Amino acid sequence: MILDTDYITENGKPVIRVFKKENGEFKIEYDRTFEPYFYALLKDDSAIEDVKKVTAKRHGTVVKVKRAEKVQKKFLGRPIEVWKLYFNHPQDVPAIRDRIRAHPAVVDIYEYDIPFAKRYLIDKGLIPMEGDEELTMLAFAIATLYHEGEEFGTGPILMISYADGSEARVITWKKIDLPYVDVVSTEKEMIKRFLRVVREKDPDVLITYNGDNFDFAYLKKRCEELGIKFTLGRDGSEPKIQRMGDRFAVEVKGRIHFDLYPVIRRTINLPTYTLEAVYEAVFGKPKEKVYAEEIAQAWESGEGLERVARYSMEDAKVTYELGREFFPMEAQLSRLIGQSLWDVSRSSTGNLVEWFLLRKAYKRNELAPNKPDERELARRRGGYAGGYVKEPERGLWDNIVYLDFRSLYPSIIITHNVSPDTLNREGCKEYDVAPEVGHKFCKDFPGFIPSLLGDLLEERQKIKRKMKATVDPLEKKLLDYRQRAIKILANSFYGYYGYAKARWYCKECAESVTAWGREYIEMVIRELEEKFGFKVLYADTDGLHATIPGADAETVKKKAKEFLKYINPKLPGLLELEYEGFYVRGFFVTKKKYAVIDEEGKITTRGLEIVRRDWSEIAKETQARVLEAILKHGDVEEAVRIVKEVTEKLSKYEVPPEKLVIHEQITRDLRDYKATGPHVAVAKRLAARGVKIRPGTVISYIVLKGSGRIGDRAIPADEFDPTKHRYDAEYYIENQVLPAVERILKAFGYRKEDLRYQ
DNA sequence: CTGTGGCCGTGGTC
DNA sequence: GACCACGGCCAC
Ligand SMILES: Nc1ncnc2c1ncn2[C@H]1C[C@H](O)[C@@H](COP(=O)(O)OP(=O)(O)OP(=O)(O)O)O1
Ligand SMILES: [Mg+2]
Ligand SMILES: [Mg+2]
Ligand SMILES: [Mn+2]
């Protein structure tokens, strides 16, 4: 099983290294035969003579074209002649490429920015993570001495916990009478002890939660301060701090550093992303949090250190368990993209598509288009029309069926062959004409991307089957995640068409797909309402809620199933409308915002404050009980009672601070805020106190009593003291709770005045 | 930073 | 007050 590739340099020449685990044995395979290259398109092949003489000087050594050879390839399906330019070292490519491209006789150059080790994986047809090979895994975590306002890594590490299938232990340098703690003499010894555990357990995978940004950087800092070599790689090396825009990523050569945070952040929708919060959401159970001041208080006194050691040990065990649960998803993705697990688990979905496309293109002999330059970027800024959203019938509706297209946009792309290599192509024999926008797509031969989406849909269907059959709830949720991930990947191929930085960019494709989406959903609505007696209550892009007014439950279900048997045979190719759900009661507040209740009493909520991270819990909690009182009890006067009790509770300061907190992400550098809302305001004041804020920081705040701008009244959550200053009960009633519930109770004739406390 | 459609609170213009 | 960009997050 191939884990990774890289290259090192020996004698000025590149040597590729393949990291493999075969029959339980770790191997490093060396390939010295592989030659970096890119392609050049010429006005005429006589100019190759002059092009071959281009040189660059890098670090006082002349760089030259090692060898040129004329190759036949295809570009968007069409034949094309290019010159393959080989070189002696990968670094030769960035050094010479601009000067090759600037040559008068060179129309353009191609595939000049593919990393050499990944070029090797693609060109050699190697897929990481294939095989029954069993990998070993080890998680670790750290607990550190912390005081507000000190530089990173100033305080010593106090404990390094670690966990795998067998044990879960804490190394520390103070005496903790617990059975999983190993006390050693010094911090330096604690670390050197951790180093040996890893070397001797020899894990294939190293699992952390935010290790890319916290744990490994702290360890590196302590190692420098204590004079330790931080030897974790299987080749003896220290961890390699790669860079990835605003964040960092940490490699550990020969092993897979599996950092959970990017995957969890991508998969689970939480207001905050503490390890406790993530653990709770995946496994159901709570995790106690001990705090940096608690930790430091215990350490400087000797007392209460066993709560800290337990907390440390649970971090590792929980990290390991999260690691075990999500690893199969990342492995399969690794196989589907054809890149390392280390990459795919940190990759944007754009780069995942790009890397999948590059690999398939090599197998098809399709020269890849280039990422756009700044001028092509600017001519791609135009938008295009998206999906049809129907304004919902409002009020309370009974016996609601939900009908929804399977994998709609991918299914359109495949059925109508929507690809840049088939758009207005040649003199073709059959085409499909997109409605409204008119683009013609050749049907004589399969388009590049259309020919590839099918298998992604099968893979999802296969996982979906496994999911619907699985009874163990934990395994069913993880399987829900995997099938959602493959669905988002497949839809990302559609979005890629309209992605400005995309290689195989194609706005006509993108807008042809949406336009077909609109035609199909509107045809279904019209057939439902004008010929089968349904009232469509709501509809979005490719799904719709519908009922037969006045009919009983079993009539709606029977007529809905009848309609599907009628419509699906008139649908072309993979277009298929699915029976997706039935609800005894539902009500629709606005576009994107509704709630429905199934026959078992499960309320499904979409879009409403309940589901958002950035409303306070007290608003979300009240809306949930209102929703239950209406949808499950039909008792609207109880809903009202609920609201008035919560408004009276806020007025009397009887709601705890935690339900008052608001969570809002900083998405960009503070300097770049054209408008400064409350969360930004709080952020800027922390930034002024020397507190690192970066895109992805989640700000937690409460607004205090007062008036004026709300950002003027707002404070970090951790800093609210109910004794010293009281919270803005007025704010939470009129700006949080009442807008959340009145958008529902409006439909029953309640005005805000009916919900407040006198 | 895969796409567009959309709700909604905040606070900057008059 | 009206007007209305900006920003955040959600439904597809
Ligand atoms: N994250 C996304 N990125 C891009 N396009 C999206 C995304 N989510 C939804 N869309 C588009 C493409 C989908 O075909 C269409 C309708 O969404 P949806 O019904 O949720 O998915 P789907 O039809 O592909 O899968 P499913 O079989 O679960 O219904 O909206
Ligand atoms: Mg569906
Ligand atoms: Mg849908
Ligand atoms: Mn669908």
Residue numbers in the entry: 1 to 758
The authors write:
In various studies, it was reported that the archaeal B-family DNA polymerases accept a broader range of modified nucleotide triphosphates as substrate than the bacterial A-family DNA pols. We report the first crystal structures of archaeal B-family DNA pols (KOD and 9°N) complexed with primer, template and incoming dNTP in the active site in a state just prior to catalysis. As both DNA pols are similar in sequence (sequence identity 27.4%) and structure (RMSD of 0.689 over 599 Cα atoms) we describe the KOD DNA pol structure in the following and only mention the 9°N DNA pol structure in cases of significant differences.
Ternary 9°N crystals were prepared similar to the KOD crystals. The crystals containing two or three divalent metal ions in the active site were harvested from the same crystallization drop. In addition, we obtained a structure of 9°N DNA pol in complex with dATP and also three metal ions bound in the active site. Metal ion A (Mg2+, green) is coordinated by two water molecules, D542, the α-phosphate of the dATP (pink) and D404. Metal ion B (Mn2+, purple) is coordinated by the α-, β- and γ-phosphate, D404, F405 and D542. Metal ion C (Mg2+, green) is coordinated by the γ-phosphate, E580, F405, D404 and three water molecules, whereof one molecule is coordinated by E578 and the other by K464 of the finger domain (yellow). The dATP makes further direct contacts with conserved residues of the finger domain (yellow), N491, K487 and R460 as well as a water mediated contact to K464. The coordinating amino acid side chains show the exact same coordination in both polymerases. Here, the third metal ion is believed to affect the incorporation of either right or wrong nucleotides, thereby modulating the catalytic efficiency. This third metal ion is also present in the complexes of KOD and 9°N DNA pols, which show a similar coordination as observed in DNA pol δ.
